[model samples]
Target: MDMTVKKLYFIPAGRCMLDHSSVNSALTPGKLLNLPVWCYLLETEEGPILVDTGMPESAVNNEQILPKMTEEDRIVNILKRVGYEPDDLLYIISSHLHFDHAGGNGAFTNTPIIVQRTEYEAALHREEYMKECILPHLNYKIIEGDYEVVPGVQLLYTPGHSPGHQSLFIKTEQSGSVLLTIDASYTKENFEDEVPFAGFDPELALSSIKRLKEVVKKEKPIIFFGHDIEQEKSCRVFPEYI
Candidate 1:
């Protein structure tokens, strides 16, 4: 029997400038810069799966939310530009419970959201993290570990950026294999330099990165990151394969 797989779409959610000097001088390269917080829309055989939600408008004006933005970068608007609607999405899978990644989740209230059990629990109990991250309309399907979402799509347990954080894997007919590593480690430098940052589980982050590297080595899959402006610019965008 012959089977077919659905294609994945890349949507530019929003961009933010980070203090590059603080993270790494090399990351600065030429000038002080901000990283882009890109949310992905994965169109699979099962349905439309959103990897993350871009920053919301409230985040731009709310001072309570640290590391805020002032731009009018909206995911819904970007989706519309790409010929999609806010309600067109079938499900949303958050990399972790971060405001920038899960803020637009409220827009998809009716869609089922998938997350890790520990992540959901941690976000609820952890006041600082939860208050800024968790969406009120999250219809969570918390998994303990790795699980298959569909025939060609799988969810891998890759914690560290936040407890219970997970990455997504999809095998496409033309694109081959693709992995969405949402904040597991921001840039390739994170893995190369082995630097630990605030709110990160150093050991878990290292282990997960190593494991993911192995997966990439074996499968030669296309890796997509959460917020790496430099790396993202070099990658293919939506309506493009992989």
Candidate 2:
């Protein structure tokens, strides 16, 4: 078995300087949060896969974050530059059904999408959740727990950010193991338990943060943050693939 991630890429679809309360309620609402809207791309023998699609164009200006986004920031257009169309994507793993996470799902209605069942079901109550991004026609793969999409790439069940939030764990040879923390921890500060806000179920959120930190301690994988510009500056981004 070739348990190697040949190429991994970071695609920053856009960014939103949001309110502290919107992301984590632990902080004063007066704080402004600058978050990079990201979508990670993994290329494997199976094909190219995407993790989260970032914000859609329609939802860009309509966000509670009152954000700023550009056309180049769109994952769809980024894929184009890489010589890929939505149809070329073999699979899409949704970390959660949040607006910035699943907004681009609209473009890949025909592709197969993977999401945790808890999140998929929770979207029913959220008006702008699943159904908004995943239309009536898309193929949906609902997972209950951790699942391996392939030998090297697996989805780690790390809830808290949302009921069914997940993180991607990929085993690579040269780069070692990589953990795409997704929204499990919004920023590196979260590892120190300095999180001021959480998405839902704050109690569970903190526990999940602790869980990821423990795993990080144990596994010692190179991690990718949910939305940290500092980490972004230090890490690889397209057209450079990890």
Candidate 3:
């Protein structure tokens, strides 16, 4: 039986704290944010694959992080507009453990969550890296190395933003190839400018960027960045005219 790879949808889960004035000067006018977050949902033949769940509703009242700086409605409404309910998700993948990225893991309790072993272990030990990202879900499947989640879809360990950070590669018959570079690189400018200050590990970040560059050079995959609004708007969606 040949399983066909279908459509891939990028769902905008939520928005994070943005300090436009500060971030604009360093990169572009739209680059200011304490932490910008994006939640992606890839619709495939197997099921709806969620990448990086956004901040949960509880985060709105949590005082530890910037609770007051969240925009949860944007994500909720986005899902509503697209006719996708929370339970539609079958599998969830986290690029890394960050409060803004993995806070909504609780939303899909029945789905099998996929994450790297290093990331799971770090979250288990209550390390600072995992403090904000860990959720109370028992159905997590810890991945040890690179592997294919579905046909034509590959998850690769990039590990720079965090010890177990990963990126998703999708090769679609209709859309060609696309790379979801979660937070390993925030924007295309991060690769173009080669900025060093925004990352946790400069060396690892650079290496990952180089690897992504090679992939783009060879496969010419449409790169979907973690936080560049402009680049994201330019991406092509299915149905041709939407």
Candidate closest to the true structure, highest TM-score: 2
lDDT (Cα, 0-100) at 52 in candidate 2: 91
Per-residue lDDT of candidate 3, residues 1-242 (tens digit): 43434666665554655544322235455443544456665667777677776676666645313533345434454456656676676778888776667766766567778999977777777446444467665478789768788776789787766777889888765676878888777766676676643545668877877887887798887777787766756665422311
Q: Give lDDT per model, in order.
A: 0.70, 0.79, 0.67
Give candidate 3 regions above 4 Å deviation: 1-4, 18-36, 61-87, 126-132, 236-242
Model 1 earns a TM-score of 0.83
Off by over 4 Å in 2: 21-24, 60-64, 128-131, 194-196
Ten-residue region with minimum lDDT total, candidate 2: 59-68
Better of 2 and 3 by lDDT: 2
Model 2 clash pairs are 13-73, 24-197, 24-198, 25-197, 26-196
Best lDDT among the predictions, by candidate number: 2
Q: List, residue by residue over 1-242, the lDDT tens digit for candidate 2.
A: 65687788888788887877755566666877788888888888888888898776775555546556777767678778778999999899898888788877878877789999998888867664645565656788999888999777899888877889998988765587898888877777765655655666667777777777787899899888787766878877888876
**Is 1 or 2 the stronger prediction by lDDT?**
2
Instruction: Kindly give the stretch of ten consecutive residues in candidate 1 with the minimal lDDT sum.
Output: 63-72
Clashes by residue pair, model 3: none
